[PDB]
Amino acid sequence: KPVQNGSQLFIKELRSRTFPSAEDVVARVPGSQLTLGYMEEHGFTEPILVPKKDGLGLAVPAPTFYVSDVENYVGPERSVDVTDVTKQKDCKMKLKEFVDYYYSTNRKRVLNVTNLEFSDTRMSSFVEPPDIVKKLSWVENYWPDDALLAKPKVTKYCLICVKDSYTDFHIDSGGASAWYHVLKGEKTFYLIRPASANISLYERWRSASNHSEMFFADQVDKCYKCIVKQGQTLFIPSGWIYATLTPVDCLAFAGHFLHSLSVEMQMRAYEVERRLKLGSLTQFPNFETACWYMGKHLLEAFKGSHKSGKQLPPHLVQGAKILNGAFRSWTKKQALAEHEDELPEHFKPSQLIKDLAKEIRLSEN
Numbered sequence: 001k002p003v004q005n006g007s008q009l010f011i012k013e014l015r016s017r018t019f020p021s022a023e024d025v026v027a028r029v030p031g032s033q034l035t036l037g038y039m040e041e042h043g044f045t046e047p048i049l050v051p052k053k054d055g056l057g058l059a060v061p062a063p064t065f066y067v068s069d070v071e072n073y074v075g076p077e078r079s080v081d082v083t084d085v086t087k088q089k090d091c092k093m094k095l096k097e098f099v100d101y102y103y104s105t106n107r108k109r110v111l112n113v114t115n116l117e118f119s120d121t122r123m124s125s126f127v128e129p130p131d132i133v134k135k136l137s138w139v140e141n142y143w144p145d146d147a148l149l150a151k152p153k154v155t156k157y158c159l160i161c162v163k164d165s166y167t168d169f170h171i172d173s174g175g176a177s178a179w180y181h182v183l184k185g186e187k188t189f190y191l192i193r194p195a196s197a198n199i200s201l202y203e204r205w206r207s208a209s210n211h212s213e214m215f216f217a218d219q220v221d222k223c224y225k226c227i228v229k230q231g232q233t234l235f236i237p238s239g240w241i242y243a244t245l246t247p248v249d250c251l252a253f254a255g256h257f258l259h260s261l262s263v264e265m266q267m268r269a270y271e272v273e274r275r276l277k278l279g280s281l282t283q284f285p286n287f288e289t290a291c292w293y294m295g296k297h298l299l300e301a302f303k304g305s306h307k308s309g310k311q312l313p314p315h316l317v318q319g320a321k322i323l324n325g326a327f328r329s330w331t332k333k334q335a336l337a338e339h340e341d342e343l344p345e346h347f348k349p350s351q352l353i354k355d356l357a358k359e360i361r362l363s364e365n
């Protein structure tokens with residue numbers, strides 16, 4: 001007799017379990033200290049909690065902004081993805097109907113909205129991602145405004161979760177990093193380090209037919225518990241395997257981004273999700289396109305280095321090597337035309353690869 005993940009009993013069982021504190025792993029940092037220099041010094045390999053939004057350059061509405069306000073600014077008629085936590089099955093419904101449920105007393109069901117991207121709505125102007133995210137983000141820096149392919153629509157999510165909701169262990173799509181801001185309520189994260197063997201266990205667990213009957217954290221050494229409270233912001237690094245529990249009704253904002261400190265992990269995660277073939281619904285759209293733009297940027301940086309007389313930093317050269325490898329796999333004979341759909345206009349992949357390979361050789365000397 002197995003326990004279904006996200007069921008009433010599961011939650012009761014999970015609430016009772018003791019986990020190691022995120023204390024020893026999650027750094028608490030004031031917003032003004034979260035700079036590019038800080039990220040480079042530490043490598044953004046561990047999650048970071050910023051207890052107050054001051055200095056982050058994050059814009060969000062006041063905590064007097066309610067789910068009812070979300071309905072108004074997003075649009076009552078908007079189709080949204082709703083997860084039935086007690087079944088771990090998703091469905092579609094008008095936001096109006098979810099909001100109706102949310103304000104119901106005697107909720108029979110445990111339902112959440114965790115995929116509402118609002119950048120195309122009136123609510124978009126009320127939220128601006130942290131400055132550090134804009135500084136790190138490959139799309140923000142390298143995807144041109146006049147591009148014929150649409151930017152990955154992953155920059156502004158509104159998360160609405162009722163008390164006792166649960167999101168099972170996962171790695172976010174594209175191995176993207178995340179910022180996560182709790183506006184009202186609190187959100188508990190269960191964090192697992194993306195050590196290589198953990199990643200492999202994760203892939204095997206997730207590919208198993210009975211994954212919903214198995215608590216993944218049982219298979220790893222350390223799963224850290226991190227409570228994120230009202231007004232706090234959590235930055236989750238590339239590749240981290242995590243689940244969440246919602247202790248009280250919670251409203252949160254989040255966004256996802258790729259960056260130059262985790263090229264290797266981004267590719268490893270992308271490779272895993274492609275073998276899993278999930279149709280994630282939360283997929284990082286045009287991950288490959290963002291990588292092509294990064295690759296073009298790196299080539300320009302290499303060429304520029306000859307005029308500046310200053311070498312690119314080692315992690316960028318290593319990043320270039322990893323990207324060039326991916327570029328080769330995506331354009332191989334058998335490498336499909338699913339891959340060609342993600343190539344930006346005006347790209348000559350075989351020429352880019354050859355030019356990057358040469359610049360890398362020159363740089364290494």
Ligand SMILES: O=C(O)CNC(=O)C(=O)O
Pocket residue numbers: 114157159161166167172178187244245252254
């Ligand atoms: O909000 C939650 O409980 C879970 N959200 C995520 O996993 C995410 O934003 O990527």
Ligand SMILES: [Cl-]
Pocket residue numbers: 137138139140256257258259290
């Ligand atoms: Cl990005």
Ligand code: NI
Pocket residue numbers: 170171172
């Ligand atoms: Ni997630």
